[PDB]
Symmetry: C2
Subunit: 115 residues, 2 copies
């Protein structure tokens, strides 16, 4: 378990910024939201839910050579690039994405789910 | 027939520049060389045999997109470009070439031989 201390809490259901709150996390789920067990101190930060990007293509990235690298590159090279792409996406603040095309992405999803 | 009047004649067999000469051409072959019938006046020009380029590739020309245009272009497009390539080569002064690779070149040779 862990107790997260947000300084300001954004209510997505309404769209308003509330006051200080304390989040109680256990077994990967939120159990309690009390206004005002390890402690994570985020009293200086605005505390938000994770973002979702509904249109991504994690198996490619456009470049000046994009059209040529469809007859030379194999899916394993795309898989090796997708590791860094996915880490960058997660570090940017997006904890969920909807991939809208590509054959490497289901394998990447299975690999991420397995740790 | 035709009588060509060179001002100066280059002797390829020896490698020296001779004096004025008159060439007699009939049936596509040289018949008579006389030092000093239509007349072609080239008394102001140095009169040389046609050149031969022993290493050409008339079916292609390098460009920034050369490597990509091997999965998009068909041989007919290369054939359409080879017409201008061959005309430019002939106008540059080269009446004979040795093509050292490519599948369009035998067809271009057959087309040129047929007129």
């Amino acid at each position: 378990p862990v107790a997260v201390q947000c300084g300001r809490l954004f209510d997505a259901r309404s769209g308003q910024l509330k006051g200080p709150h304390t989040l109680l996390v256990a077994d990967g789920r939120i159990r309690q939201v009390l206004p005002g067990a390890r402690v994570v101190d985020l009293g200086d930060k605005v505390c938000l839910p994770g973002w979702t990007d509904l249109h991504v293509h994690l198996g490619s990235q456009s470049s000046p050579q994009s059209y040529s690298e469809d007859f030379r590159l194999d899916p394993v090279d795309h898989a090796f690039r997708a590791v860094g792409y996915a880490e960058k996406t997660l570090m940017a603040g997006f904890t969920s994405v909807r991939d809208l095309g590509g054959e490497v992405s289901p394998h990447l999803r299975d690999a991420i789910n397995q740790g």
